[PDB]
């Protein structure tokens, strides 16, 4: 299912600060940036990497929660739905 995506304004800076660059990326590229972004900003339970702490950062606002599990792609997809600008309908 992994399709191509396009990081908007507030979405580009996210991947950029994570070592990304450009205006085109797939689900695999984005997913890889997400993790790196969180680790770069330090928004997770060092004791449990599987437990992310969105707190109130960019990701926190986009999702609208407090924390989300990494090993559980539940809220991640729900947010990406309208967050990850995908193409091909």
């Amino acid at each position: 299912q992994i399709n191509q995506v396009r990081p908007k304004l507030p979405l580009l800076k996210i991947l950029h600060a994570a070592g990304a660059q450009g205006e085109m990326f797939t689900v695999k590229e984005v997913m890889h940036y997400l993790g790196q972004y969180i680790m770069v900003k330090q928004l997770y339970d060092q004791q449990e990497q599987h437990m992310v702490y969105c707190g109130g950062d960019l990701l926190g606002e986009l999702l609208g929660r407090q924390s989300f599990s990494v090993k559980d792609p539940s809220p991640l997809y729900d947010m990406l739905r309208k967050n990850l600008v995908t193409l091909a309908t």
Partner: peptide, 15 residues
């Protein structure tokens, strides 16, 4: 040798 987020993160089925 390195795992960290990569260990679990990877799990996330992009598909």
């Amino acid at each position: 040798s390195q795992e960290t987020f990569s260990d679990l993160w990877k799990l996330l089925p992009e598909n």
